[PDB]
Structures are given as structure tokens and as C-alpha cells.
Design a protein around this ligand. Structure first.
Ligand SMILES: Nc1ncnc2c1ncn2[C@@H]1O[C@H](COP(=O)(O)O)[C@@H](O)[C@H]1O
Ligand SMILES: Nc1ncnc2c1ncn2[C@@H]1O[C@H](COP(=O)(O)O)[C@@H](O)[C@H]1O
Ligand SMILES: [Mg+2]
Ligand SMILES: [Mg+2]
Ligand SMILES: [Zn+2]
Lengths: 436, 391
């Protein structure tokens, strides 16, 4: 079995993901995130927002509506150019992407017809062109349209960034491998407005910076690469684009896009100034000059980043068991800051004397972290159940704990154990979990 | 001038919110959150998730798609009795085949995964499933400011319980949820319970109402806490064909759990916290945010822009930005800067003066009292941490 299939089976089995509406028929085009998946996803988001907004004086945040005025997508060009060629089979009449011959539904074509990938909706009582709106295909336009508002309230000046996370929607004709390509996804996008003569320099900076981010949160550098977009595959808003690519493990070419870092020159502020009538240029008072900023844009995928982190973390190693033998052990080697469960509190047995201390310790820890309590089954099996989902530390409460008031901390990867007094455990875990 | 108008002006001016698509004509049915608004929003959401999911053994989280299968909303009864749902068309053919609905609530995503969560999370009633997410309603008319919009964020939790306990649990959550708003700094006097009467998917509903200050009747819904009986799990079993009941092996019994549903509005909660924190004293304008909600936790202020002070101030601001959202301000007189920070609820201001070059200490000013205390720099992070009560 391939690595992607293994990781997907693990995710479904342990509740990182469920198929949306599974009981009514789910597709790989729609996924719900279970109790572990939601925490993993939020953790990745939080680390992104820390790196991009909180830690940087030059970058501020925003959250804009999924449904913007239609004119926006006329000015961005998405109405006119955000379309792909579709060919309908002449035997089963199922439409497919032409660029992407034989039919993959029956095997037996019409002339290509352009199909716009944005999703439509209607606001108001009349299902008419007055109420036609597009579910945004990208979060960038809500940033561009607020560039001046932000310059004003935030008192900012180029170079500076506006960052955002949110849901986007594309009418994807076919579902991707697992969660890679879905019709509803979550993006993390930042638009960095710079004085044009510096754009190129700034560009490389962000390409490097973004790359290091993935490495800093645990992704093997060898599983990452850079790809230069050719002029033909350039977006309608881009002059130069570089993609970070991750080795996901697909059949055939195992490499796939992970984050797109684009030099969008002055396109976006220009077009929105032209269409809205509002001047979105920037006035440098230190020089008495006025220019439309260039835009460097790191746009990552939350769900693609979760898939990348989850695949890179997966590993199988030979770990000794209680019998004195050696088993194959499935471990997700997450960075502590991403792991969905930071600590597991595991009484040695269901004994009535161990549950009080174990439960009080679980509560104390829940004050700070997401915690898991499990007294079911043999302890070693529970250690492995936690290792399977990337839990960084297991805290075992045994009978000696009733006398020395100390517990056994077990580190996930090394499986090494250290006995520490309870009244210090929190502190211990804190230093090793590397939160704020 | 009403308090709502004043707060809305302040929110617009300091970039708490902007009207979505302002340059193309905005409406009160759509609002973006600016640099401060996003942070206050995310802080409210984070405190809700900490209270509900992280802190409780008996509650686990989930996040389900906005667009679910159409049969889901045929089974929940929204297609027949709710039309306020927003439609969209998936796939290459724009017809009733691809017709889907944008969820008007986040609950059905939970109900349909009840059995999945019981299985993977190894949970047994009483336990809850919590979710935050975007919901859409084709609201005909927009509300005051950001109170009623077509697109909003919800914080819903469904607590599944053995039926004979529901009523008790119901009251519990009613009280619990209320305390939450109070523990985060809303005045108890501005909160009240409103019992839905028998005439008004549910059996019994209590709304926590906040005194927003509307013209006329200044009260409004802030959070609804309903007892939905066994309606939802029942209907999804029947329509899907999948048994969503629970089997207790301790008693060898099988039942359809009853559901207690606290459901709060992220945007309504933001509007309530903002209106409540607003205040004027001597004159000064202050948002008395709880530290955990304040969009900016600390502002670093050099006495003057100067080669001796500014580097020390910048270094300190970075150290603090490791943990909290910080604001660095070197413009204008120090008291002007204090006023600017008080206006947006910043709990603490740190000033670097010339004395700081000699005793390596700074001046920490507590927003509400305005009391100042001189703290060594190598301790400021701990000093602030103890007082900010989260990061
Ligand atoms: N259909 C999709 N499903 C999941 N992630 C996506 C999808 N489309 C785009 N992304 C992510 O969004 C990022 C930016 O997209 P773009 O703005 O189109 O370059 C990509 O690098 C992906 O990580
Ligand atoms: N259109 C809306 N705008 C803002 N908040 C809303 C809206 N609809 C519902 N809510 C919030 O969601 C909570 C639960 O709603 P419900 O599921 O309708 O009981 C309410 O108490 C509100 O706080
Ligand atoms: Mg920042
Ligand atoms: Mg929990
Ligand atoms: Zn065919």
C-alpha cells in the first residue's frame, strides 16, 4: 500500500477526518475534521498566525466576508478568466477537464466549452442578476479592497503585510487524492505591499521565509522543493510565481503544490482603483511621491499543509514491547506545537486508588493543554495508541505515586521515561511543549 | 447619542470593522474585521473553545463542511419549514442535480457524525460535540451594526445525554454559559434569561439576552440554549438508514440520546463584549476588556524616538511579541499614546525612558487604574504574563 493510503486510513480510523455527510454518501471532495483533526488544523493555523501577524511588526491581520460584492470579481478578472475547458463525453455525457483520448467514466467528445470555476449564490428573494454573488475563490480580494482602510487605521507604510485565513470555494470538477483537492478549502494568505523597486528582493525573502517555516515545524527539508511557474501557467494576476512543493507520495509524480508565493506587481490595487473609483495608491510623505505598491503574496493551504504535516510525521519504527520482543510501531512524529493531544494521563490500572490522583492531574493539565485520559486496557497498548496520533508525552500514575507523589513522564519518540514529582509536572511539560 | 452608535463609530475608526466591499458600496449585512477586530474575534472564539473543549473531559471538538449533502437538510426539516437557505450549484451541470445549500447552522454537521465521534473518541452519554464555523442565512433586512448579517460565525455545542437527565443538564448549561460571559467581564446586570413560551426541532429553549442598547427594546438574543429532545438523532437515523442511537453496555440498554444545545453567536458575542467594555471617565474613553479578549495585550512606548531609547524599546517589543500581540508606538507625546491605547482596551502600556538606560527598568501602566510601577526588564514578561491570564 502507498504511504498516502496508509496515512489516510489512519486519519479516518482515529478521527482526524470523516467524509462529510458519510451516512448520506460522502465524496473525497468534502471532508469533516474530527476531534483530533480540528485541533491539528487549528494548531497549524495558530502557528501560521503567530509567525505572520503576531511576531511581525510589519504584518497585520484581517478577516473578510466569504461573499463580497459581485463587482469585485469583475475587477479582479475572475468573472472573465477564472474558467477551464470542459469536454462532454458523447456516450455517457459526463463532463471532464480537457487539459487534464479516452473517457475515465465509460472508456469510449464534444467541442470544449469554457466553464467558470467560481460557485454562485443568490442573496435576496429574487433569484436574478441583482442578487448574483460569487463565493470567493480566494481571500486576497478582501485584503486588496481594504488596503487603504488598513493603511489608515493601522498606521502602516510599505513594506507591510495584511494577512488572513478563511474558507474559499472552487467548483472543482473532480475530487483530489484524500483531502488534497476539495471544493471547499481553507487558505492562509498574506499580501505584502512593497515599493516596486524592492519587490524582487522582497520576493526572494518571502520564498525563503515561508520555506523555513515548514522546516521549523518539523517537515524534512528533503521533502520540500521550489518550482518556478512558466509564463503559460502563470495566473491572470501574476508576473512571477514560485511554488513550494511537498513530496506527498502520489502515484506517478509524488510532488504537489503546498504554497504559492507570487509577485503580483501592481495589478490588484490598480484594477480595484480603476473599477471602484477609489484611489488605492500609496503616498510616501518622506519623499512626496505616490506609487501603487507591488504585492508579494504567500498563499498557503491550511488543508494541504495539514496533509503535508501529517504525511511527513508518519513513521514506523521497531519498538520493544512488554513481552521482551520488538513490534512495528506506528508513530506520528509531530512538532509539539501541532500535535492535537499534548499529554496523555494514564493510570497504571483501573484501580480505585490511582484514579483520584490521575483525574486531578488530568484536570490541572487541561487548564493549559488539550489532554487525554485513558484507563482502558494494558498500559503499553495505551502508550502505542497515543504514539499512533502523535501525542508528545504520556504521564503514567502508578501505585508508587500514592507514596512518593510522583509520576512517570514518557517521551513519545525516544520512549524514554523519567520520574518527576507531580507539583512540577506542569512546568516540565511546559518547557518541552514550546507554547507561548 | 445612543451607545451603539458611539461604539460603532469607535469600531470603524480604529479598524475593528470595515464594511465588506466598502469601495463598491457596503451594507450592514456584511462586515470585515480589521486588524483589531480579527484579534478580538479570535480571542473570544479561543476562550469559548478553551472553556468548552480543552477544559472539559466530556466535550470534544469537530469542524464540518459548510456545504453538506442536500439530504441532510431534507432530514433536519430545514427544506420544509425554515426559504432562508442560500443555494449553490456544484459540478459541471447547473441544475437541481447539483443543488446544494449553504448550512444555516453548524449543528447538522455534528448530528450526522454523532456515531463517528462516539466510535473514534470513545465517548458515552453524557458528552458533547463542539464546533465553531460560518453559517449563512438569507436575512431579508440587516440589523444594527453587525448584529444580524447574512454570513455569521457560530459557536455551537450539542450535549448528548440519557433522556431522564436532560432537564437537569439543561439548567446546568443555562447557568454555565451565563457565568462564562460574566467571567469574561460582562456586567451581570446587562444579562438576563428569556424563556421561550410554549407557543415559541425543540421542546424547551432559553435565550441569554444582552442589553445591547437598541432604540426601543434594548435587549437582544446573545446565546440560545435549547433542549432538542431526541429529534435530531432520530430523524437522521430514519432518513440516512444509519443507526445513530447509543448502546450502553453497562445496562445493556439502547436509547436515542436527548440533546442540550448551547449555541452562541461569535459576532453577537463580539458586539456584546464591545458595548459592555465601553466607558468614559475623567475626560477619557476606555474599553475595559478582559485581558484575554483585548486585541492588543501590551503597547511599548519609547519616551522619544531616539538612538538610545528606541533600540531598547524595539528589542523589548520583540521579546513580548513572542507571546502576545503587541503594538509599538513612537508618535506624539506619551499621554496621547496612552489615550490611543486606552481607546482600544490595551491592558498594559510599557514606557522606556532615560532612567531605563541606567537601571534597565521600564514603566508599566495598568489601563483601568492608570497606576504605574517600575519593573526590571528581565522580569517584565513574567509580570505581564501573570496579569494577562493567557496567550
Ligand atoms: N482545491 C484545493 N484544495 C485544497 N487546497 C487548495 C486548493 N486550491 C488551493 N489550495 C491551497 O491554496 C494555496 C494557494 O492557492 P492559489 O492562491 O490558487 O495559489 C495552494 O498552495 C494550496 O495549498
Ligand atoms: N444572522 C445571525 N447573525 C449573528 N448571529 C447569529 C445569527 N443567527 C444566529 N446567530 C447566533 O447563533 C446563536 C444560535 O442560533 P440558533 O442555532 O438559531 O439558535 C444565536 O443565539 C446567535 O448568537
Ligand atoms: Mg503584528
Ligand atoms: Mg476534550
Ligand atoms: Zn464517457
Amino acid at each position: 500500500a502507498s504511504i498516502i493510503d496508509t496515512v489516510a486510513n489512519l486519519a479516518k480510523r482515529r478521527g482526524f477526518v470523516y467524509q462529510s455527510g458519510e451516512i448520506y454518501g460522502g465524496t473525497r471532495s468534502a471532508w469533516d475534521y474530527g476531534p483530533l483533526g480540528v485541533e491539528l488544523k487549528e494548531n497549524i493555523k495558530r502557528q501560521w498566525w503567530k509567525s505572520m501577524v503576531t511576531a511581525r511588526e510589519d504584518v497585520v491581520g484581517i478577516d473578510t466576508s466569504i461573499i463580497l460584492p459581485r463587482e469585485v470579481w469583475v475587477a479582479s478578472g475572475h468573472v472573465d478568466v477564472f474558467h477551464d475547458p470542459l469536454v462532454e463525453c458523447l456516450n455517457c455525457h459526463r463532463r471532464h477537464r480537457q487539459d487534464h483520448v479516452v473517457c475515465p467514466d465509460c472508456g469510449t467528445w464534444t467541442e470544449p466549452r469554457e466553464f467558470n470555476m467560481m460557485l454562485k449564490t443568490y442573496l435576496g428573494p429574487i433569484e436574478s442578476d441583482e442578487g448574483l454573488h460569487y463565493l470567493r475563490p480566494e481571500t486576497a480580494q478582501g485584503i486588496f479592497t481594504n488596503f487603504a482602510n488598513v493603511v489608515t487605521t493601522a498606521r502602516k507604510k510599505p513594506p507591510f503585510g495584511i494577512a488572513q485565513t478563511g474558507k474559499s470555494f472552487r467548483n472543482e470538477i473532480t475530487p483530489g487524492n484524500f483531502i488534497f483537492r476539495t471544493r471547499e478549502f481553507e487558505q492562509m494568505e498574506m499580501e505584502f505591499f512593497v515599493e516596486p523597486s524592492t519587490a524582487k528582493e522582497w520576493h526572494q525573502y518571502w520564498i525563503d521565509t515561508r520555506l523555513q517555516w515548514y522546516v521549523d515545524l518539523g517537515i524534512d527539508r528533503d521533502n520540500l522543493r521550489l518550482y518556478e511557474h512558466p509564463p503559460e501557467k502563470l495566473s491572470h494576476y501574476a508576473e512571477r510565481t514560485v511554488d513550494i512543493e511537498y513530496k506527498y507520495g502520489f502515484a506517478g509524480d509524488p510532488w504537489g503544490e503546498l504554497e504559492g508565493i507570487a509577485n503580483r506587481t501592481d495589478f490588484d490595487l490598480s484594477t480595484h482603483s480603476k473599477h471602484s473609483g477609489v484611489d488605492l495608491s500609496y503616498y510616501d510623505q518622506a519623499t512626496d511621491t505616490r506609487y501603487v505598491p507591488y504585492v508579494i503574496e504567500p498563499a498557503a493551504g491550511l488543508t494541504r499543509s495539514l496533509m503535508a504535516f501529517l504525511i511527513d510525521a508518519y513513521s514506523e519504527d521497531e519498538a520493544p514491547n512488554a513481552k521482551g520482543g520488538v513490534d512495528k510501531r506506528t508513530v506520528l512524529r509531530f512538532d509539539p506545537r501541532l500535535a492535537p493531544v499534548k499529554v496523555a494521563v494514564l493510570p497504571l490500572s483501573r484501580h480505585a486508588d490511582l484514579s483520584p490522583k490521575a483525574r486531578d492531574l488530568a484536570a490541572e493539565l487541561r487548564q493549559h493543554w488539550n489532554v487525554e485520559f485513558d484507563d482502558a486496557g494494558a498500559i503499553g497498548r495505551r502508550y502505542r495508541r497515543q504514539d499512533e496520533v502523535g501525542t508528545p508525552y504520556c504521564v503514567t500514575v502508578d501505585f508508587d505515586s500514592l507514596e512518593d507523589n510522583a509520576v512517570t513522564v514518557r517521551e513519545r519518540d525516544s520512549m524514554a521515561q523519567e520520574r518527576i514529582s507531580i507539583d512540577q509536572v506542569t512546568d516540565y511539560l511546559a518547557v518541552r511543549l514550546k507554547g507561548c
